[PDB]
């Protein structure tokens, strides 16, 4: 084997010390997940209540949850039933178990995407490149059905078909849709979903690292205050020279 190529550095807004997530783009990436990726991928750690006040308002999240049928029970007779979703429910999964997922995808398992940007090298840059790396095979490489060639996937042979194509959904804010736009948006959503506490973490760090730095200066002055009394000291042997 060989070392895979390092992906390029895209200028995502969140990459700076002083920056937050880009929420308008996080919203559009959630439409892309719901209408394209959710057909094969689960996000089992996310719950609808996580979106309230951080991405979408409460009344809008309720409408999205209620459009799904969720299993609950047991009832008084010891049976199972279905009901519309509520804020407390988790994102719905497309398959009940892993064996059923592989059976529907030719033996390949689509991984859970709850921590996906923390679970790959280079994270979001890798995901952006992957989504636009499908090419025709090179001379001398023939792939059997169910496999596709990709620049950035280790080994080049991936079992996921190209998920994106120009013009396929209509954003709600009017932004024109294309493969590159959807890629940038879905990456932002999945980066936020990997750790929604990123903004709280960074804002607290700025307050702390700045305070500690100032105290470090003060302690430096207090140390040199005592350093000078012995660095300027005079010791004479035999007789006194100068006062």
């Amino acid at each position: 084997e060989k070392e895979p190529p390092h992906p390029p550095s895209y200028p995502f807004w969140f990459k700076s010390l002083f920056h937050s997530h880009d929420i308008p783009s996080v919203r559009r990436g959630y439409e892309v997940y719901r209408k394209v990726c959710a057909t094969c991928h689960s996000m089992e750690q996310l719950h609808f209540r996580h979106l309230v006040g951080e991405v979408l308002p409460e009344k809008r999240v309720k409408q999205i949850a209620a459009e799904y049928d969720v299993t609950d029970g047991p009832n008084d007779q010891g049976e199972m039933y279905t009901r519309p979703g509520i804020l407390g429910d988790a994102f719905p999964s497309p398959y009940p178990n892993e064996e059923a997922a592989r059976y529907a995808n030719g033996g390949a398992y689509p991984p859970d995407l709850s921590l996906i940007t923390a679970a790959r090298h280079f994270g979001p840059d890798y995901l952006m490149a992957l989504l636009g790396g499908y090419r025709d095979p090179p001379e001398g490489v023939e792939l059997r059905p169910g496999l596709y060639w990709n620049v950035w996937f280790p080994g080049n042979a991936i079992a996921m078909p190209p998920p994106l194509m120009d013009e396929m959904i209509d954003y709600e804010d009017g932004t024109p849709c294309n493969i590159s736009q959807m890629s940038k948006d879905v990456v932002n959503f999945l980066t936020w979903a990997t750790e929604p506490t990123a903004d709280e973490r960074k804002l607290y760090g700025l307050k702390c690292v700045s305070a500690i730095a100032i105290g470090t200066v003060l302690m430096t002055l207090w140390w040199r205050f005592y350093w000078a009394m012995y660095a300027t000291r005079r010791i004479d042997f035999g007789k006194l020279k100068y006062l």
Partner: protein
Amino acid sequence: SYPYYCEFFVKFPNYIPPKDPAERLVDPRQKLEPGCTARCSLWVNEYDACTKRVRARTDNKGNCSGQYEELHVCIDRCVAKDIFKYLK
């Protein structure tokens, strides 16, 4: 263990509005690929030359994956420099 690792000295670009809103219905990668394909021409020729050497061999062995990977990696790195200028 982190969603991303922060970076120093990143150039955040300014959005370039289009002329007709219907223009951005096609991927703006098509406008940047030709120029990026000319700057990586040193690898376009190494790939075309390796195909001839493989088409001529008698046995059914040989491939061009090595040269092909280097070529398209060069192009993707050239596109990344400016792609976000045309995305909201």
